[PDB]
Design a protein around this ligand. Structure first.
Ligand SMILES: *[C@@H]1O[C@H](CO)[C@@H](O[C@@H]2O[C@H](CO)[C@@H](O[C@@H]3O[C@H](CO[C@H]4O[C@H](CO[C@H]5O[C@H](CO)[C@@H](O)[C@H](O)[C@@H]5O[C@H]5O[C@H](CO)[C@@H](O)[C@H](O)[C@@H]5O)[C@@H](O)[C@H](O[C@H]5O[C@H](CO)[C@@H](O)[C@H](O)[C@@H]5O)[C@@H]4O)[C@@H](O)[C@H](O[C@H]4O[C@H](CO)[C@@H](O)[C@H](O)[C@@H]4O)[C@@H]3O)[C@H](O)[C@H]2NC(C)=O)[C@H](O)[C@H]1NC(C)=O
Ligand SMILES: *[C@@H]1O[C@H](CO)[C@@H](O[C@@H]2O[C@H](CO)[C@@H](O)[C@H](O)[C@H]2NC(C)=O)[C@H](O)[C@H]1NC(C)=O
Ligand SMILES: *[C@@H]1O[C@H](CO)[C@@H](O[C@@H]2O[C@H](CO)[C@@H](O)[C@H](O)[C@H]2NC(C)=O)[C@H](O)[C@H]1NC(C)=O
Ligand SMILES: *[C@@H]1O[C@H](CO)[C@@H](O[C@@H]2O[C@H](CO)[C@@H](O)[C@H](O)[C@H]2NC(C)=O)[C@H](O)[C@H]1NC(C)=O
Ligand SMILES: *[C@@H]1O[C@H](CO)[C@@H](O[C@@H]2O[C@H](CO)[C@@H](O)[C@H](O)[C@H]2NC(C)=O)[C@H](O)[C@H]1NC(C)=O
Ligand SMILES: *[C@@H]1O[C@H](CO)[C@@H](O)[C@H](O)[C@H]1NC(C)=O
Ligand SMILES: *[C@@H]1O[C@H](CO)[C@@H](O)[C@H](O)[C@H]1NC(C)=O
Ligand SMILES: *[C@@H]1O[C@H](CO)[C@@H](O)[C@H](O)[C@H]1NC(C)=O
Ligand SMILES: *[C@@H]1O[C@H](CO)[C@@H](O)[C@H](O)[C@H]1NC(C)=O
Ligand SMILES: *[C@@H]1O[C@H](CO)[C@@H](O)[C@H](O)[C@H]1NC(C)=O
Ligand SMILES: *[C@@H]1O[C@H](CO)[C@@H](O)[C@H](O)[C@H]1NC(C)=O
Ligand SMILES: *[C@@H]1O[C@H](CO)[C@@H](O)[C@H](O)[C@H]1NC(C)=O
Ligand SMILES: *[C@@H]1O[C@H](CO)[C@@H](O)[C@H](O)[C@H]1NC(C)=O
Lengths: 222, 696
């Protein structure tokens, strides 16, 4: 069904869907709710409706995502990470800032504090931008006929890399092993790191009467 | 001032743009806003009225893992051509209609400044820009532009600055075109593909001479010294070189030394520098900035300091972190003008000694994540420090008594060290905003003298020491702590009394203290924004049913291993960990139903709870581990227990009972018939993993 709690989730087979209202206090008079629609094989479909207004209009309110569960392995031993994601978005009125992005967290050990974050931004609506120390892209890389600009930034004690798409990608199909291999070869990512989390979801800033529907989502680690 | 034509033109330009974050709100046709000069971004002339500056530029504000900019979306109207005397035009961060640069910009006939950098312009650069004869500053960097012909540059004979970074650069003869600008000083060509387009010696020979000062050549896959050698045709006038993120794999070029007037060298984020600064340095004499971060230098630190000996009186910032440097930090105060020094995450196995007395101007220092030994130096030799991080080292000895002479310190982190004691001067800091001395072997007792004058302390972290904290009665604390982290610290036989005047604190970890007193009456209400409450392994007694009032920020409640008694406290609507084992509670737990709870871990084992389990567990589907063992429950189990699809553990033994995937463990011993969960929202966006080493 549909659940509106702050930390509530739905654990299905080989998938977990969160609401993650982790910064709801930064805004006033907002709400959000996520729900799963159909699960079949390795494909999951879901939706997320929200309405956030006012408050700190320059902060992420939530990261309602659909994460994958897998046996943690080092980046060396990962052969391929196939992924697909088809989504549609429906906002209304004006002053709409949001984001759609993959998040991959890697650390030194199997269960450790997140040392490296890799975000893949398939859409940047209304001024949403990645973390960047200099505010400027540091690499331009093409993976599978998809262009990306790479940003590097600090998050406490974590290094965040960001691949922002040059154009909006509403239908994505790729192998994320290429991104990690590029990062290890050029950007200095250690190859012995353990990939602990892989997920994808939205990140609203300010939006009224908004709803995002993921018609299909798949991921695996080989 | 404010001739009506300019006001009409500016209003027409406003009409096209679609502002959404309050910008341009000062503009309007209302009689109250008639005067043009007072508008934001509009500057006029004193004698005449035609405006001189139009600076509608924005800035980035950044959060945990995102940044935002109030970009102006709209159409750039041609009515700006009514600005016949304009010379400043800065529309940088706004994203307009993501199309080609407007052509009418070439017809301003008085422009002297133009900054369209970091907008979302695309397409070819307009060819009419040859009409901008009077331009001096031109910034068009980091847009999705395509540049393959630079024939328009030859007619622009007044530039002192040209930024063309972040473009699909394909001009094979760019050096010849750039050289045609006699007065060029600073050149920005970062993020271009300059690796594929290296100038030839013949065309460098067939060129004029122009005195460049600052070079910003970053984000090109150079990877060798043979692809950027051309910049050594500028040794006479070079003053700043920025060569970061170039995947350089080799020795730093020896010709970087002997570059007179050099003041800013950036070589951060390379592949392998293989020895760091060579012997060619020490001839610099004017260096003021040197960033060699994350480059795998593998250099001996005293060798680097002796090779940087030329710029002792001028070097200000020295970033040398995320490298692999070994040795001992000796004689750092001989650098008169040093203000920042970063040496995080190295293989420094040495000492931190001064061995001679001279003051230092360092304001920022961090030596964390190393293997440094020995005692701390006389910290009174660093009077102007503002931050000081020395965590994860092997430092020993007491903190020197001069620590109280800083008078400007804001952060002091000495965690994960083998420090033995704390001095009495710690109170006289008066501007410390955070103090972390956790995981040290700290002995002795801390009286109020150590805390006498910290009127700005917000963070107190003395976790896991042999320390003691006894403050005299009738003491009025001068600080309002927001995080209180004092585990395994002897806070006294009685409940601490300095907590009465403490408000507005987010977490409270006073567990493993030796409190042997009942809950005081004055401790009746926690602050509204309380987040973490841990009172485990104490001897506190009383009733907590009147202490938890369902705040909206609760995440962790740990009142285990105490002498609490009474009805079960109200469970917060957003709590996640709820540990209450080893106490003396009693009664039914029917009050776990009236509100929806997002708890992921609750433990009620080793109490005297009796009665029947409520058939209301559908209201808490977030449960992972459930423990009701060693209690005195009775009656049939609720069928709603089958609705906890997220359960991973269910311990119910030593009871009097009668009568869901991922349930790894199912213990139902007696009753007459390592696991790891996730607490999300701990480190802001990041989650935290909690391991439950449950018994069997
Ligand atoms: C055309 O228009 C465009 C508009 O887009 C213009 O572009 C803008 O131009 C302005 C200037 O006009 C720029 O503003 C300036 O920014 C700089 C940079 O600030 C950022 O970096 C700081 C330093 O970072 C190092 O240090 C920090 C820790 O201190 C560390 O975390 C970093 O990772 C980094 O560390 C690296 O270096 C170390 C030392 O070498 C190494 O050890 C280490 O290993 C690394 O290698 C940083 O401090 C600063 O922090 C700010 O932001 C964070 C996050 O938001 C915030 O938390 C902080 O509180 C700070 O607010 C930034 O990250 C900045 O130094 C300049 O400061 C001047 O102005 C202030 C104003 O008060 C003065 O006080 C200063 O003394 C100084 O004079 C200035 O703000 C802007 O960045 C730039 N933007 C873009 C997108 O281009 C363009 O210039 C225009 N062109 C023309 C011709 O006009
Ligand atoms: C404000 O307007 C005055 C008047 O035009 C400008 O002063 C003129 O400047 C030009 C160029 O230097 C001279 O040829 C004129 O002789 C000056 N006028 C007078 C009366 O002497 C002035 O420069 C303008 N302000 C700015 C900032 O440009
Ligand atoms: C630093 O500059 C000096 C000059 O001030 C360089 O000295 C030259 O090279 C050697 C040095 O052993 C000697 O022949 C002379 O001192 C100089 N040669 C002349 C004048 O022809 C010195 O080489 C520079 N440092 C480095 C590492 O090259
Ligand atoms: C805590 O520090 C403050 C700093 O303002 C001290 O307040 C004054 O300090 C000056 C010295 O700079 C003395 O001349 C004043 O007599 C102090 N005023 C008061 C009311 O004490 C303050 O004294 C310090 N705390 C203690 C206990 O000395
Ligand atoms: C589960 O939680 C809901 C909501 O917290 C409870 O709903 C309450 O039901 C009673 C009896 O019908 C009403 O008097 C209250 O007004 C309801 N509260 C709200 C907030 O709607 C419900 O009783 C709980 N238990 C079960 C088994 O559903
Ligand atoms: C550029 O200058 C030339 C030379 O006077 C002139 O003929 C042309 O009209 C100018 N361009 C524009 C757009 O005014
Ligand atoms: C070499 O320089 C001369 C300077 O007079 C110039 O005329 C000539 O065009 C240059 N050679 C080439 C190939 O451009
Ligand atoms: C410029 O560098 C080249 C290197 O190929 C050199 O031949 C030439 O003499 C230099 N010109 C100077 C230093 O004026
Ligand atoms: C209360 O704490 C907050 C930090 O969350 C701080 O911003 C605020 O200034 C504090 N107020 C007082 C009166 O200490
Ligand atoms: C509470 O503190 C004790 C010791 O100080 C620790 O073992 C326990 O894990 C803490 N509670 C939580 C929820 O982490
Ligand atoms: C403090 O508590 C510890 C552990 O319970 C105990 O060993 C020690 O004797 C106590 N100290 C005093 C002074 O009672
Ligand atoms: C608290 O309980 C423990 C064991 O249940 C007991 O040994 C101790 O005496 C109790 N404390 C008091 C003050 O009675
Ligand atoms: C525990 O429950 C039993 C019956 O199941 C009964 O003796 C009484 O209610 C309780 N006794 C004690 C000692 O707690």
């Amino acid at each position: 069904g549909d659940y509106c709690g702050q930390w509530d989730w739905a654990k299905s087979t080989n998938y977990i869907v969160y609401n993650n209202l982790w910064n709801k206090n930064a805004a006033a008079s907002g709400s959000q709710c996520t729900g799963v629609d159909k699960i079949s094989g390795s494909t999951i479909a879901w939706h997320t409706s929200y309405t956030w207004t006012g408050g700190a209009a320059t902060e992420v309110k939530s990261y309602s995502n659909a994460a994958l569960v897998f046996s943690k392995k080092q980046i060396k031993n990962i052969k391929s990470i196939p992924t697909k994601m088809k989504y549609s978005y429906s906002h209304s009125s004006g002053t709409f800032v949001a984001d759609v992005s993959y998040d991959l967290f890697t650390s030194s050990t199997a269960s450790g504090s997140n040392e490296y974050e890799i975000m893949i931004w398939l859409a940047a609506y209304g001024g949403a931008g990645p973390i960047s120390s200099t505010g400027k892209a540091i690499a331009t890389v093409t993976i599978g006929s998809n262009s990306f600009k790479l940003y590097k930034g600090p998050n406490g004690s974590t290094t965040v890399f960001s691949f922002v798409a040059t154009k909006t990608i509403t239908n994505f199909s790729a192998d994320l092993q290429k991104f990690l291999s590029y990062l290890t070869k050029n950007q200095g990512l250690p190859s012995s790191q353990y990939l602990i989390t892989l997920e994808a979801g939205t990140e609203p800033f300010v939006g009224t009467n908004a709803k995002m529907t993921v018609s299909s989502f798949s991921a695996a680690v080989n | 001032l404010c001739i009506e034509k300019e006001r009409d033109a500016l209003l027409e330009f406003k009409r096209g743009l679609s502002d959404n974050f309050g910008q341009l709100s000062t503009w309007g046709d209302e009689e109250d806003k008639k005067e043009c000069c007072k508008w934001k971004g509009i500057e006029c002339n004193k004698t005449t009225g035609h405006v001189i500056v139009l600076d509608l530029h924005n800035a980035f504000t950044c959060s945990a893992s995102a940044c935002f900019a109030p970009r102006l979306t709209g159409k750039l109207s041609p009515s700006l051509l009514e600005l016949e005397y304009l010379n400043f035009l800065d529309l940088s961060v706004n994203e307009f209609e993501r199309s080609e640069i407007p052509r009418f910009i070439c017809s301003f006939k008085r422009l002297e400044y133009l900054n369209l950098s970091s907008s979302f312009f695309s397409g070819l650069i307009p060819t009419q820009f040859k009409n901008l004869t009077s331009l001096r500053i031109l910034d068009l960097g980091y847009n999705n532009l395509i540049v393959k012909d630079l024939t328009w540059l030859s007619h622009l004979s007044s530039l002192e600055l040209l930024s063309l970074g972040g473009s699909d650069f394909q001009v094979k003869n760019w050096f010849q075109e750039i050289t045609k600008l006699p007065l060029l000083k600073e050149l920005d060509l970062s993020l271009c593909g300059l690796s594929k387009l290296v100038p030839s010696p013949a065309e460098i020979a067939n060129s004029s001479l122009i005195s460049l000062s600052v070079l910003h050549l970053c984000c090109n896959e150079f990877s060798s010294s043979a692809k950027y050698s051309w910049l050594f045709n500028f040794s006479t006038s070079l003053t700043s070189i920025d060569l970061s993120n170039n995947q350089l794999d080799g020795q730093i070029d020896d010709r970087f030394g002997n570059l007179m007037y050099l003041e800013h060298l950036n070589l951060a984020n390379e592949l392998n520098l293989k020895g760091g600064i060579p012997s060619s340095f020490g001839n610099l004499t004017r260096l003021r900035y040197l960033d060699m971060s994350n480059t795998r230098t593998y250099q001996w630190l005293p060798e680097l300091f002796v090779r940087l000996s030329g710029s002792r009186k001028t070097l200000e910032v020295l970033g040398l972190n995320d490298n692999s440097m070994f040795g001992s930090l000796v004689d750092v105060t001989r650098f008169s003008a040093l203000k920042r020094l970063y040496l995080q995450k190295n293989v420094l196995n040495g000492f931190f000694m001064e061995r001679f007395g001279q003051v230092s101007s360092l304001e920022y220092l961090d030596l964390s994540d190393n293997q440094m030994r020995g005692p701390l130096p006389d910290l009174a030799l660093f009077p102007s420090l503002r931050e000081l991080h020395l965590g994860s080292n092997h430092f020993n000895g007491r903190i020197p008594q001069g620590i109280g002479k800083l008078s400007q310190l804001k952060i002091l982190d000495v965690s994960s060290n083998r420090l033995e004691g704390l001095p009495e001067s710690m109170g006289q800091l008066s501007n410390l905003e955070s103090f972390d001395a956790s995981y040290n072997v700290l002995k002795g007792t801390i009286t109020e003298s150590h805390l006498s004058n910290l009127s700005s302390l917000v963070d107190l972290d003395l976790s896991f020491n042999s320390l003691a904290l006894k403050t005299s009665i009738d003491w009025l604390p001068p600080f309002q702590l927001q995080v209180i982290n004092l585990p395994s610290c002897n806070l006294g036989p009685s409940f601490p009394k300095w907590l009465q005047s403490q408000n507005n604190y987010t977490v409270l970890d006073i567990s493993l203290a030796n409190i042997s007193d009942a809950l005081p009456s004055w401790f009746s209400g926690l602050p509204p924004d309380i987040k973490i409450l841990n009172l485990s392994n104490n001897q506190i007694s009383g009733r907590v049913s009147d202490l938890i009032e369902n705040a909206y920020d609760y995440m962790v409640i740990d009142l285990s291993s105490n002498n609490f008694s009474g009805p079960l406290p109200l469970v917060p609507t957003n709590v996640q960990i709820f540990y209450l084992h080893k106490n003396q509670f009693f009664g039914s737990i029917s009050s776990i139903c009236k509100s929806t709870t997002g708890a992921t871990s609750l433990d009620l084992s080793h109490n005297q709870f009796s009665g029947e389990l409520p058939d209301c567990w559908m209201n808490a589907t977030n449960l992972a581990v459930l423990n009701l063992a060693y209690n005195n429950f009775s009656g049939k189990l609720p069928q709603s227990l089958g609705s906890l699809t997220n359960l991973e553990a269910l311990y119910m033994r030593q009871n009097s009972f009668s009568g869901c995937q991922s349930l790894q463990i199912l213990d139902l011993g007696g009753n007459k018939l390592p696991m790891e969960f996730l607490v999300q929202g701990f480190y802001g966006k990041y989650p935290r993993h909690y391991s439950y080493l449950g018994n069997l």
